[PDB]
Write a protein that binds this ligand. Structure first.
Ligand SMILES: [N]
Ligand SMILES: [Pt+2]
Length: 121
């Protein structure tokens, strides 16, 4: 099984978003099915899928806290934060474009969870 890996990618991977504005967040949250109810905060990693998997092995990661891993590389990311309001569509989102290392949980050398706490801030 890799269902938790492809689910991590649907929820937290966007290869090349072009524009990382409010409208982009509002669009992608709908496409990835995170608007029923409106997810309060969600982060998309950009760039190569290769380098995100490599976080699970010592090449591109370290141990972090209890169950997690933090990346050695920095990643282009966009955080989408809910304005208002209602936990029900329509969901408006504020986009914050960042560049830093990511915290994930790994299993079978694949990321299966993103720690959103480092992007709440
Ligand atoms: N996740
Ligand atoms: Pt998760």
């Amino acid at each position: 099984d890799n269902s938790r890996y492809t689910h991590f990618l649907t929820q937290h991977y966007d290869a090349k978003p072009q524009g990382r504005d409010d409208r982009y967040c509002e669009s992608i949250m709908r496409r990835r099915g995170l608007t029923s109810p409106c997810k309060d905060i969600n982060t998309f990693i950009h760039g190569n899928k290769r380098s995100i998997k490599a976080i699970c092995e010592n090449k591109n990661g370290n141990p972090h806290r209890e169950n997690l891993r933090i990346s050695k590389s920095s990643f282009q990311v966009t955080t989408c934060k809910l304005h208002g309001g209602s936990p029900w569509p329509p969901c408006q989102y504020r986009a914050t474009a960042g560049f830093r290392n990511v915290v994930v949980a790994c299993e079978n050398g694949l990321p299966v969870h993103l720690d959103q706490s480092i992007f709440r801030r």
